Amino acid sequence: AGAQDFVPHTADLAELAAAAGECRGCGLYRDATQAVFGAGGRSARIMMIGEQPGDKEDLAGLPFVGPAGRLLDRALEAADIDRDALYVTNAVKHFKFTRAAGGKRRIAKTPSRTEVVACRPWLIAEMTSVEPDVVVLLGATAAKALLGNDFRVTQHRGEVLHVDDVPGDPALVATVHPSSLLRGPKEERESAFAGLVDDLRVAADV
Ligand SMILES: O=c1cc[nH]c(=O)[nH]1
Ligand code: SF4
Structure with a gap:
C-alpha cells in the first residue's frame, strides 16, 4: 500500500504537501529532515519529475x-518555458542519503523500486490535482515510476509517449537527469545540455 493510506481525499496541493509531511509510506521519513513536495500550481501545463530531493x-x-536546479533553469530559459507553467516534483519525497567522511555533503542514495512504488500515490495525487498536458521525466528513476522498471531513457529520449495506465493520458517526454550534465567532458556536457533543451521544447509544444 505504501503511502496510499497517508494520501488525503483532496486535490489541494497545500493539503497534500502537509499530509506528505506526516507520511510513513516507506522508511525514508526517519533520517530525512522533512518531506519535499512539489512546487507550482494546478494551472500548470507542464509537470516535471526528478528522482528525489537532494541535500539542499x-x-x-x-x-x-x-546545482541541478541551476542547470535545469538554464535549459528551461533556452526553451523559453515560463516557470509559471511548471509544476516540479520528484518520484520519492524524502532524501535518501549517506555521509562520506571528508565529504562536502550528504550523498544521495538511489531509491529502490519499493520506495518508488511506495511513494507513487503522491505523484498520482499531483497528476490528478494539476492535470498536466505533459509530464517531463528527468532521469531513469522518474521515467520508470510511470513507464516501467524496464524503460530506458537513453533509447526513448525526446519521444512523445502516451501510456493508457497513466492518469489524464498526458503526453510523456523522458529526458536525462540534469545532475548528469554536471559530470563529464566539456563537449559531452554541452551536447547533453542541448539534448535536454530539445526535450523541453518538444514538451512545451505538446
Ligand atoms: O532529482 C533531483 C535532484 C536534485 N534535486 C531535486 O529536487 N531532484
Ligand atoms: S519517501 Fe514518499 S512514501 Fe516514503 S515516507 Fe517519504 S513521502 Fe512517504
Missing part, C-alpha cells in the same frame, strides 16, 4: 534549489 532541497523544503 531536504533543508530548503523546495525541489531543484541546488
Whole structure:
C-alpha cells in the first residue's frame, strides 16, 4: 500500500504537501529532515519529475534549489518555458542519503523500486490535482515510476509517449537527469545540455 493510506481525499496541493509531511509510506521519513513536495500550481501545463530531493532541497523544503536546479533553469530559459507553467516534483519525497567522511555533503542514495512504488500515490495525487498536458521525466528513476522498471531513457529520449495506465493520458517526454550534465567532458556536457533543451521544447509544444 505504501503511502496510499497517508494520501488525503483532496486535490489541494497545500493539503497534500502537509499530509506528505506526516507520511510513513516507506522508511525514508526517519533520517530525512522533512518531506519535499512539489512546487507550482494546478494551472500548470507542464509537470516535471526528478528522482528525489537532494541535500539542499531536504533543508530548503523546495525541489531543484541546488546545482541541478541551476542547470535545469538554464535549459528551461533556452526553451523559453515560463516557470509559471511548471509544476516540479520528484518520484520519492524524502532524501535518501549517506555521509562520506571528508565529504562536502550528504550523498544521495538511489531509491529502490519499493520506495518508488511506495511513494507513487503522491505523484498520482499531483497528476490528478494539476492535470498536466505533459509530464517531463528527468532521469531513469522518474521515467520508470510511470513507464516501467524496464524503460530506458537513453533509447526513448525526446519521444512523445502516451501510456493508457497513466492518469489524464498526458503526453510523456523522458529526458536525462540534469545532475548528469554536471559530470563529464566539456563537449559531452554541452551536447547533453542541448539534448535536454530539445526535450523541453518538444514538451512545451505538446
Ligand atoms: O532529482 C533531483 C535532484 C536534485 N534535486 C531535486 O529536487 N531532484
Ligand atoms: S519517501 Fe514518499 S512514501 Fe516514503 S515516507 Fe517519504 S513521502 Fe512517504
